[PDB]
Design a protein around this ligand. Structure first.
Ligand SMILES: O=C(c1cncnc1)N1CC[C@H](c2nc3ccccc3o2)C1
Length: 339
């Protein structure tokens, strides 16, 4: 309908204005108190912090510039911040501040206290089809938005989907997201979710995000992913074969949608045909979904996470607490000039 077309046209206008003139240097480290490490990886970490003047809580992602360079992530970290400061959608975590110093890059996001979807999935075992479908509809709308801005997300998995105070999803981690007209070539993403054309080192497009939504819906409704194996090479052989086995408890409508999203031939995959996202939105598995009501946040969620207030960390796990050290000398200034 024209209403959807005009919504996506305005979304692209507003994105391009911020894309062409990015904000920079909007806070500094000593405006915040450090509370707790919420997650740690090979070149960065995420910390709960409190702003000292307002008392508001935020999630601060800290990237070590020297490790970014060594792990070949310069372009990816510049993509992440430039895209996050330009997007606006109900199911995307909001960037509030960004800045850099002699040692680190910082992105200060809204803090979502209910934790990762992955923790709730593993606690309950699997989600019922109605519960899986409520989350899946939020991902379909978010990919419709991102793809219309020529963005590919490239890191869909349950650890990157946080559950908010109303039980809705907020997508975090734009470290692999990129603006792409046509094809792109980088090998990136988590093994269990990679589409075959990425594993085969082909030039690929937004169809890899719709493959990864098939893997996500399978894992939500089964409790484990479709292509599981002990080592990555074994996973990759299963993926490129595309042989999938479905639990008997899956509905016939869920199996049919999954066979069309987990289609090895990218030119036959739902989301990448002439009708685009509408082949997914109009599939029988989504017949009960009110797409406008989901966007408007008017549907009652399947569950609300248990937490005590905006500073509660009980839905995230425990990590060794390390210093946030800042060198007396500037590192890698040229590489990160635009940040
Ligand atoms: O704490 C938040 C959170 C994020 N955004 C808003 N609210 C909360 N985590 C913690 C776990 C997750 C996470 N992602 C990471 C990426 C790189 C390195 C470490 C990471 O740990 C998101």
């Amino acid at each position: 309908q024209e209403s959807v077309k005009e919504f996506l046209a305005k979304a692209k206008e507003e994105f391009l204005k911020k894309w062409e003139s990015p904000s920079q240097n909007t806070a500094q480290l000593d405006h915040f108190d450090r509370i707790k490490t919420l997650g740690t990886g090979s070149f960065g970490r995420v910390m709960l912090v409190k702003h000292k003047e307002t008392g508001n809580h935020y999630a601060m992602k800290i990237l070590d510039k020297q490790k970014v360079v060594k792990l070949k992530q310069i372009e990816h970290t510049l993509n992440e911040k430039r895209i996050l400061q330009a997007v606006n959608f109900p199911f995307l975590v909001k960037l509030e501040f960004s800045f850099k110093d002699n040692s680190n890059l910082y992105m200060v996001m809204e803090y979502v206290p209910g934790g990762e979807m992955f923790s709730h999935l593993r606690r309950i075992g699997r989600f019922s089809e109605p519960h899986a479908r409520f989350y899946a509809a939020q991902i379909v709308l978010t990919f419709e938005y991102l793809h219309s801005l020529d963005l590919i997300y490239r890191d869909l998995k349950p650890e990157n989907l946080l559950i908010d105070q109303q039980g809705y999803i907020q997508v975090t981690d734009f470290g692999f997201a990129k603006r792409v007209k046509g094809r792109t070539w980088t090998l990136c993403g988590t093994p269990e979710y990679l589409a075959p054309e990425i594993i085969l080192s082909k030039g690929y497009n937004k169809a890899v995000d719709w493959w990864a939504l098939g893997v996500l819906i399978y894992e939500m409704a089964a409790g484990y992913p479709p292509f599981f194996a002990d080592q990555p090479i074994q996973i990759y052989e299963k993926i490129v074969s595309g042989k999938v086995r479905f639990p008997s408890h899956f509905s016939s409508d869920l199996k049919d949608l999954l066979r069309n999203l987990l289609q090895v031939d990218l030119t036959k995959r739902f989301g990448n045909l002439k009708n685009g996202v509408n082949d997914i939105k109009n599939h029988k598995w989504f017949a009960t979904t009110d797409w406008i009501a989901i966007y408007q946040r008017k549907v009652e969620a399947p569950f609300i996470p248990k937490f005590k207030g905006p500073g509660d960390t009980s839905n995230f796990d425990d990590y060794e607490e390390e210093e946030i050290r800042v060198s007396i000398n500037e590192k890698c200034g040229k590489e990160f000039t635009e940040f």
